[PDB]
RNA sequence: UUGAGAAGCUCAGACGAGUAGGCAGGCGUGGAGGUUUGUGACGAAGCCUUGGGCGUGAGCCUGGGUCGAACAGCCUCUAGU
RNA sequence: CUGCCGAAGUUUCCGGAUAGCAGAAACUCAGAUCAGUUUUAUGAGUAUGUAAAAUGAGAGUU
RNA sequence: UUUCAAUGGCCCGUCUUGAAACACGGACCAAGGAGUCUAGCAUCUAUGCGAGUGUUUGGGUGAUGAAAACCCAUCCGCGAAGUGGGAACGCCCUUGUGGCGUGCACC
């Protein structure tokens, strides 16, 4: 019938364990999406350059 | 922050209100009156709409998206959950950098409300939409 | 152009910075109001300050 | 849109040169007097000494 | 021309670049569309920087008269790229500058009609008009793009018949002169454009196929 | 009792001058010692690699640097840490070896008595 | 017809007590950034005055007298206002 | 300093939760409803009540 | 402006209570003199960005004032993972009909 009082401490420690990794994955995916969401350069933006 | 005039201090929102004040007064379009009313509203009463919701609402039930412009007086954010963006023509106050790039790179055009007023001064063939006000 | 960049190209000297976009495209609102696109559909303008 | 394309360069003697620079995109940025004033109001308080 | 000099800040260099453009546009070699689009970016700003009404209505004549100088093979491309570069820059113009670009289209509308007449001497008129109607329908009067401003097309409707009568003062032959207007009234998705274009247009059925 | 931070810009400058004062004393050598690469001791961070305190005696022995000369050339020694896995041993031995590949050690004068 | 500080101009009708309370727009003071290519020993500031004027009002402008070195309008910021 | 809005001053349980009075916001809604009002006749007991006429006002709201 | 004539006209502020009254405070004048600063929380508005957002613990940097401004490595906080109906189209002399309905409320 349910777990030791220390297992609740293990439960919250496992919840926060993925906090760092999920932040790293979310940051990496955002950069990859932003890399692929690049507006193509207009062939006329540098006509007078 | 409503009713007579916008409480916003942006000069470019004041210029858009100037344009649609004329359109709402010198035409018989309830679209121009509706756009003018929503230009006066606060940021809380103009919730953002997503790229996914625009794609879903246009091709809804009977679908038949055709080429009607989608107008929202608010921000068009991006839904990274969806993988393929259809060809959409959207007019909005603001587009995010992700939403704008995804519409342009695979799809059609992003417009401002003054570019829309030149294309459809009476608002004809437009899909006016709103965001979910319930946060 | 490296300090600020553009609206579509990132600034070289500011990481992940793009120039802000405007909620209006042509800020000359008299050009839009007095354009052939708009003036061809408006109803005949009433008078200016009206007679009493 | 439709801004002036290029900018002329002036020599140290005050005469125009044959070289021009394309106008940078920052001069096309929105001019926001309300937003500049609000940021200036805050930034001007950042060198105050306590009393 | 080098395009950069065509948009220079002094009128002398812009005038010199225009004079050197006649040799450039006369070469008997094929020009890509992007090359003409880059050229019309400089030529647009040559007109955009024009100062006084006497100059900017003589400069418009110079640009319009530049069409017959272009080689026959890439003459349609020159006109097609002008109407593309005017469609994408029309809204960026301001009120104090539209009245001189309005005359630029009118001078270029007449340039197309004159070029049709010039080609009609050596070839059948129907073939030349079909070539131009393809250019008109693939560019400005195209219904597949909704971004082309209605101000260009309303102006074209207003001046279509009068600039045609100028090229043929005695009488004009029968051809599909108004085909782009009929095609775009019937098929365009712009309700405002298709509802008031017949009112603006002065289609004279007397010299069109019935 | 309120702790104000009006000296925050002053402390930034004071620490910068300490870095420059140190670099003035030790001209060609780095202002910091080389730190090892270790893994934080928890399931939340054990996938990250951070900087350690010093190199273990087994790391120094493998790389060829004795613990008595390691400190003289700017290699910290951690007698407490140990290599429980072969990956930590290889990650930090290579760090030492790359450090020794980029190192110019200036010679020192030695006293040589005339007689035997 | 020029009467687009569109935040402007214009037309019409109705209404007007007010405690607690609520909401707008303004007046004034010390200091700050900007501005008036600002005022000042040919007289700044202050003070006096049955001088004159402006505003519904808070207040402001001015003549004369006195006086002797500094001071103000506008946009914004600030508060021991 | 001026302008505008403007109470309650008490039912109910019980220092309050209220309600109610007075404003703000979010609405929809004249092809609709509302009312310190009078009615038509019959229901019950001149009064009282009823559903649907007259008069006025656009109203209902959260 | 001083005064005269005719008409009217109480002493303010507080407290009280039904308004009062009454009782309190006030010899006069000048100067000083009372909702401030800060840390939370919630609301509304504005602004920036937006499935993200937050540079200023700190580092870099700033030749002329360097407590400013400018730049950001790794973390971290928070966040996240049937009908009615606005608007528009096409018909209908118009009403009205037909196709299409966002938000929200019903099912």
């Amino acid at each position: 019938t349910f777990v030791s009082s220390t297992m609740v401490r293990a439960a919250i420690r496992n919840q926060a364990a993925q906090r760092y990794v999920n932040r790293q994955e979310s940051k990496l995916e955002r950069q990859v999406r932003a890399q692929q969401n690049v507006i193509p350069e207009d062939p006329l933006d540098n006509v007078f350059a | 922050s409503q009713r007579s005039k916008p409480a916003s201090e942006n000069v470019y929102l004041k210029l858009l209100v100037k344009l649609y004040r004329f359109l709402a007064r010198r035409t018989d379009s309830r679209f121009n009156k509706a756009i003018l009313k929503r230009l006066f509203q606060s940021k809380t009463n103009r919730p953002p709409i997503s790229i996914s919701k625009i794609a879903a609402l246009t091709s809804r039930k009977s679908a038949s998206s055709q080429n009607k412009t989608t107008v929202v007086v608010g921000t068009v954010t991006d839904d990274e959950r969806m993988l393929t963006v259809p060809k959409l023509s959207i007019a909005a106050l603001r587009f995010t950098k992700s939403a704008r790039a995804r519409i342009l790179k695979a799809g059609g055009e992003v417009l401002t409300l003054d570019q829309l007023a030149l294309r459809a001064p009476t608002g004809s063939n437009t899909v006016l939409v709103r965001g979910k006000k319930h946060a | 152009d490296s300090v600020f960049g553009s609206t579509t190209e990132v600034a070289q000297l500011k990481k992940n910075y793009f120039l802000p976009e405007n909620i209006i495209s042509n800020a000359d609102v008299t050009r839009l109001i007095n354009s052939d696109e708009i003036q061809s559909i408006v109803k005949a303008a009433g008078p200016s300050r009206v007679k009493r | 849109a439709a801004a002036r394309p290029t900018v002329s360069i002036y020599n140290k003697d005050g005469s125009v040169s044959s070289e021009t620079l394309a106008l940078p995109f920052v001069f096309k940025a929105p001019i926001r007097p309300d937003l500049v004033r609000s940021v200036h109001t805050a930034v001007a308080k950042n060198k105050r000494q306590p009393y | 021309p080098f395009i950069k000099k065509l948009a220079a800040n002094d009128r002398k260099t812009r005038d010199k670049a225009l004079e050197s453009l006649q040799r450039f546009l006369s070469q008997k070699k094929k020009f890509e569309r992007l090359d003409f689009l880059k050229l019309w970016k400089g030529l647009f700003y040559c007109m955009w920087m024009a100062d006084k009404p006497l100059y900017q209505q003589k400069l418009s004549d110079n640009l319009a008269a530049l069409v017959p100088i272009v080689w026959i093979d890439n003459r349609i491309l020159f006109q097609s790229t002008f109407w593309e570069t005017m469609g994408r820059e029309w809204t960026g113009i301001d009120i104090l500058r539209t009245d001189k670009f309005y005359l630029l289209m009118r001078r270029f509308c007449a340039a197309a009609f004159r070029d049709i007449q010039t080609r009609s001497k050596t070839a059948l008129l129907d073939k030349v008009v079909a070539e131009y109607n393809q250019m008109w329908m693939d560019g400005p009067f195209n219904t597949e793009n909704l971004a082309f401003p209605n101000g260009i097309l309303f102006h074209l409707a207003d001046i279509w018949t009068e600039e045609l009568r100028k090229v043929y003062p005695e009488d004009v032959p029968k051809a599909d002169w108004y085909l782009p207007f009929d095609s775009t009234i019937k098929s365009s998705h712009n309700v405002v454009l298709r509802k008031t274009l017949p009112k603006r247009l002065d289609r004279v059925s007397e010299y069109t196929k019935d | 009792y309120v702790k104000t931070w009006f000296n925050q810009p002053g402390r930034k400058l004071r620490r910068r001058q300490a870095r420059q004062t140190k670099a003035a004393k030790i001209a060609p050598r780095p202002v910091e010692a080389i730190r090892p690469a270790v893994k934080p001791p928890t399931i939340r961070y054990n996938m990250k690699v951070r900087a350690g305190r010093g190199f273990t005696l087994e790391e120094l022995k493998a790389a060829g640097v004795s613990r008595r000369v390691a400190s003289t050339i700017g290699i910290p020694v951690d007698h407490r840490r140990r290599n429980r896995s072969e990956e930590s041993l290889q990650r930090n031995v290579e760090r030492i070896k790359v450090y020794l590949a980029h190192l110019i050690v200036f010679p020192r004068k030695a006293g040589q008595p005339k007689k035997g």
Side-chain angles (χ1 to χ4, degrees):
Chain A
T1 55
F2 100 93
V3 277
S4 176
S5 62
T6 75
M7 272 330 107
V8 184
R9 195 82 157 275
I12 57 103
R13 99 172 39 257
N14 213 9
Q15 185 141 17
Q18 313 291 339
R19 281 208 288 190
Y20 171 68
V21 217
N22 293 334
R23 201 87 190 252
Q24 297 305 287
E25 297 145 359
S26 201
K27 195 188 103 143
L28 260 164
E29 283 158 348
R30 189 214 195 290
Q31 299 167 180
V32 166
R33 273 196 315 262
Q35 249 153 23
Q36 86 175 337
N37 276 330
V38 161
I39 282 182
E41 59 277 70
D42 216 273
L44 302 191
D45 58 6
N46 50 0
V47 58
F48 301 113
Chain B
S1 72
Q2 66 159 273
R3 205 55 236 173
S4 58
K5 75 201 269 186
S8 156
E9 211 56 53
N10 191 355
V11 273
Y12 297 105
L13 183 67
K14 287 171 174 183
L15 294 176
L16 277 173
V17 159
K18 196 171 311 198
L19 163 73
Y20 274 93
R21 267 199 204 278
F22 176 79
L23 276 171
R25 184 240 316 174
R26 290 284 316 282
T27 61
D28 273 11
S29 278
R30 288 191 252 95
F31 180 85
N32 292 336
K33 304 194 159 29
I35 293 294
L36 180 67
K37 196 178 96 145
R38 303 194 188 171
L39 278 178
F40 296 157
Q41 274 175 346
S42 68
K43 163 162 179 184
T44 316
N45 312 134
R46 285 185 338 247
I49 197 163
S50 158
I51 252 173
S52 157
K53 190 85 198 192
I54 287 157
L57 285 180
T58 52
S59 73
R60 183 72 191 97
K61 276 166 267 186
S62 45
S64 186
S65 64
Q66 295 283 328
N67 51 40
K68 331 189 88 183
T69 320
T70 304
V71 189
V72 60
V73 191
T75 313
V76 170
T77 74
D78 182 40
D79 209 341
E80 87 273 36
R81 286 171 311 195
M82 79 165 331
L83 274 274
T84 278
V85 202
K87 182 168 87 51
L88 308 150
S89 315
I90 316 175
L93 261 185
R94 265 176 213 91
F95 292 82
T96 71
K97 293 193 279 299
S98 266
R100 186 187 306 265
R102 270 159 73 74
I103 290 155
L104 288 197
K105 92 142 166 276
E109 61 203 311
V110 285
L111 319 172
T112 48
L113 291 188
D114 51 319
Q115 290 186 303
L116 156 83
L118 282 208
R119 165 184 308 195
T122 34
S124 28
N125 266 323
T126 55
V127 197
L128 186 57
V129 290
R130 266 187 281 202
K132 305 275 201 52
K133 212 171 272 189
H134 273 24
Chain C
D1 256 353
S2 326
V3 175
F4 298 104
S6 72
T7 53
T8 78
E9 296 97 34
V10 74
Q12 287 270 42
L13 297 195
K14 305 185 188 315
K15 170 218 72 216
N16 283 335
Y17 176 70
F18 295 80
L19 270 169
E21 290 263 355
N22 216 348
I23 68 177
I24 210 172
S25 68
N26 193 22
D28 197 10
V29 80
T30 319
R31 192 258 195 275
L32 317 168
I33 287 183
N34 293 334
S35 39
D36 199 3
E37 286 96 334
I38 290 193
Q39 293 294 321
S40 53
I41 54 132
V42 289
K43 34 205 200 83
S48 184
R49 51 186 164 82
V50 317
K51 76 167 150 70
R52 303 173 71 209
Chain D
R4 198 179 41 144
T6 52
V7 195
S8 277
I9 316 302
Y10 292 87
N11 328 306
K12 34 188 302 311
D13 66 280
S15 55
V16 202
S17 51
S18 57
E19 208 35 36
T20 47
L21 278 157
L23 182 82
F25 308 108
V26 64
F27 292 100
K28 265 96 66 169
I31 286 163
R32 285 285 301 276
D34 57 286
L35 169 133
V36 163
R37 176 169 101 200
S38 266
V39 181
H40 185 273
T41 285
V43 155
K45 294 167 182 183
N46 286 342
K47 213 186 153 46
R48 303 196 282 172
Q49 287 181 216
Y51 59 82
Chain E
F2 275 39
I3 286 93
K4 202 168 169 64
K5 300 206 295 293
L6 268 163
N9 298 324
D10 62 327
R11 216 194 98 167
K12 319 285 305 312
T13 50
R14 292 201 303 264
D15 286 334
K16 259 87 157 177
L18 245 175
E19 274 134 41
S20 320
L21 193 45
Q22 267 144 273
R23 277 129 281 181
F24 176 80
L25 284 185
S26 293
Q27 309 154 252
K28 315 284 177 66
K29 73 191 194 80
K30 193 51 187 174
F31 271 154
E32 310 295 57
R33 207 200 157 76
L34 196 69
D35 316 341
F36 274 152
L37 283 179
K38 298 170 170 282
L39 156 77
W40 265 116
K41 184 75 166 167
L43 281 175
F44 160 83
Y45 279 106
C46 184
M47 180 58 222
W48 184 88
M49 296 222 75
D51 199 3
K52 316 249 212 153
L54 259 191
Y55 170 56
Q56 70 203 20
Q57 88 191 14
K58 140 189 174 168
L59 161 76
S60 97
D61 298 358
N62 297 332
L63 281 176
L66 179 48
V67 162
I69 290 115
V70 202
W71 190 32
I72 174 65
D73 255 341
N74 39 40
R75 190 171 303 170
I76 283 318
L77 200 46
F78 189 59
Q79 320 201 31
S80 146
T81 37
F82 165 73
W83 291 110
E84 148 145 31
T85 202
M86 270 294 324
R88 79 166 140 77
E89 311 235 50
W90 178 238
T91 296
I93 323 292
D94 56 290
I95 35 176
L96 298 179
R97 254 156 187 145
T98 54
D99 279 344
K100 69 190 194 201
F101 281 108
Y102 264 146
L103 184 78
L104 187 62
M105 327 195 202
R106 163 193 294 269
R107 289 300 185 261
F108 254 73
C109 191
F113 283 136
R114 279 195 285 264
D115 193 54
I116 277 155
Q117 170 188 61
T118 294
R119 293 195 207 189
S120 166
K121 304 184 192 267
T122 178
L124 284 314
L125 176 79
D126 308 324
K127 183 179 76 72
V128 202
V129 174
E131 201 144 351
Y132 267 83
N133 272 347
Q134 169 171 347
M135 176 270 291
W136 287 117
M137 272 139 57
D138 288 336
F141 292 100
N142 194 9
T143 77
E144 286 317 293
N145 62 345
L146 285 93
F148 203 90
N150 298 332
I152 313 272
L153 293 196
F154 296 163
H155 188 48
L156 285 179
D158 276 330
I159 71 185
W160 202 263
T161 314
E162 62 160 70
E163 304 296 316
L164 180 54
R165 287 203 233 259
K166 284 177 190 176
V167 186
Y168 292 106
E170 56 279 31
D171 52 356
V172 318
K174 311 265 183 277
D176 325 55
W177 297 118
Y178 303 101
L179 185 69
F181 293 95
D182 311 343
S183 108
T184 211
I185 280 166
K186 178 182 60 62
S187 319
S188 53
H189 290 102
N190 197 280
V191 3
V192 156
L193 169 89
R194 83 193 168 208
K195 278 173 103 142
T196 190
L197 213 54
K199 289 140 54 160
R200 300 288 280 260
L201 178 64
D202 189 15
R203 165 171 173 127
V204 174
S205 34
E206 198 272 345
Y207 30 69
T208 57
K209 337 278 208 63
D210 289 355
Chain F
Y1 274 86
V2 169
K3 198 262 169 201
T4 59
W5 289 59
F6 308 133
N7 67 321
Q8 191 179 12
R11 186 199 311 282
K12 182 177 187 12
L13 184 58
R14 191 190 314 129
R15 288 174 180 182
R16 286 206 91 218
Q17 286 164 336
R19 275 156 216 143
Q20 249 276 207
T21 289
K22 187 178 193 212
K25 195 183 90 77
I26 55 186
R29 75 176 166 98
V31 309
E32 331 208 301
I34 170 157
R35 294 308 158 169
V38 308
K39 298 271 195 176
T42 201
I43 196 69
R44 177 168 175 182
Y45 297 107
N46 53 357
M47 80 285 300
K48 166 150 75 180
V49 156
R50 66 156 163 90
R53 174 186 183 73
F55 299 86
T56 71
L57 317 158
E58 52 242 74
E59 270 156 34
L60 286 173
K61 188 184 185 300
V65 206
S66 83
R67 75 179 289 187
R68 293 286 138 235
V69 329
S71 52
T72 61
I73 54 170
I75 306 179
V77 186
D78 201 354
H79 67 270
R80 271 170 294 238
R81 203 164 61 77
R82 56 205 68 119
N83 285 139
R84 288 176 178 90
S85 80
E86 320 248 8
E87 267 77 20
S88 46
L89 183 48
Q90 87 147 109
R91 155 189 322 139
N92 296 285
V93 160
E94 190 38 8
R95 191 131 159 72
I96 295 176
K97 283 188 176 179
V98 166
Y99 174 78
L100 295 157
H102 291 84
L103 199 64
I104 318 144
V105 191
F106 305 143
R108 64 185 263 231
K109 266 202 280 89
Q112 168 86 278
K114 308 306 203 300
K115 306 292 118 180

